[PDB]
Amino acid sequence: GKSYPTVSADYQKAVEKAKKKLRGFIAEKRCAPLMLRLAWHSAGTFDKGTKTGGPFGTIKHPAELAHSANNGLDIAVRLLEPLKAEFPILSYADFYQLAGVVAVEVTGGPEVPFHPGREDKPEPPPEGRLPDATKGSDHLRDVFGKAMGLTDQDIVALSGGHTIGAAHKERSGFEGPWTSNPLIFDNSYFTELLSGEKEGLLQLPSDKALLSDPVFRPLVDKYAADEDAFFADYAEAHQKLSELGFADA
Numbered sequence: 001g002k003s004y005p006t007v008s009a010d011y012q013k014a015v016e017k018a019k020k021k022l023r024g025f026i027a028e029k030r031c032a033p034l035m036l037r038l039a040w041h042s043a044g045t046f047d048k049g050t051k052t053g054g055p056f057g058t059i060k061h062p063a064e065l066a067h068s069a070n071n072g073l074d075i076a077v078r079l080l081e082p083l084k085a086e087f088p089i090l091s092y093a094d095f096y097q098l099a100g101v102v103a104v105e106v107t108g109g110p111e112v113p114f115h116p117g118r119e120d121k122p123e124p125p126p127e128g129r130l131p132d133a134t135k136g137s138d139h140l141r142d143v144f145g146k147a148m149g150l151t152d153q154d155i156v157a158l159s160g161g162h163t164i165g166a167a168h169k170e171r172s173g174f175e176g177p178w179t180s181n182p183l184i185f186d187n188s189y190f191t192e193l194l195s196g197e198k199e200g201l202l203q204l205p206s207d208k209a210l211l212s213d214p215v216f217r218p219l220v221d222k223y224a225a226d227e228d229a230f231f232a233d234y235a236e237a238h239q240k241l242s243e244l245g246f247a248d249a
């Protein structure tokens with residue numbers, strides 16, 4: 001149910017230019033996982049019943065960066081500020097979601113469709129909407145389903161974002177990468193989840209919840225067996241995530 005707004009030709013030119021500069025910047029800085037996290041924490045605050053939160057640029061506000069869920073994302077915001085300044089016509093809202101799309105692309109992931117037009121809104125949402133890594137399936141459905149409005153399939157596929165990156169004990173308190181190749185976007189997150197705990201690799205309680213839930217586990221199995229299937233479902237889910245509350249909800 002998306003009706004994307006019209007933007008000027010100059011806006012579209014800046015999107016295309018920004019997309020290329022973001023590739024080079026994110027690849028050079030090796031910061032794709034952090035940028036994916038920044039885009040996801042931007043979007044993941046959307047509450048469908050109130051139409052508040054969502055990918056509308058508020059994460060750059062000190063009040064939202066201060067949310068404990070967002071520990072470390074001020075680094076992300078700061079890294080992007082010089083490049084953002086080369087594209088004054090773009091909203092921050094669009095710029096951060098574009099960075100998330102590019103982060104997935106430059107690590108070898110699917111090409112997530114991107115539509116411009118998000119406005120930068122004045123009020124950040126209240127703290128507390130992002131998921132708690134220590135809880136399980138009911139909690140994930142509360143947050144992704146009841147608040148954001150995403151499907152069970154979306155929850156499993158988007159969990160596969162942890163195929164890149166790592167936790168840091170000084171940010172969340174968890175520590176280490178989920179995969180042996182944490183700058184490579186692939187289905188390894190699910191293959192590690194199936195195989196048991198391997199030394200040095202991370203599994204959060206929220207990751208493990210996917211293995212015991214009757215709806216989530218067949219999705220984990222599909223994705224571990226079929227990377228192409230993972231990529232298709234991932235791209236659908238990331239696009240939906242990046243567009244919550246935008247161009248209709």
Ligand code: HEM
Pocket residue numbers: 032033034036037040072131132133134140158159160161162164165166167168169170171172173174204206
């Ligand atoms: C399903 C529920 C989720 C929970 C409970 C969760 C929890 C976390 C936690 C605790 C960390 C480590 C933060 C740190 O110490 O640096 C993390 C990082 C990460 N998350 Fe998630 N996450 C979830 C879903 C998502 C989604 C939906 C995506 C993108 C699709 C995502 C992408 C990432 C990435 C890329 C990292 C690594 C960041 C880095 O390397 O700096 N997460 N997440």
Ligand SMILES: [K+]
Pocket residue numbers: 163164179180181182183184185186188189
């Ligand atoms: K990987």
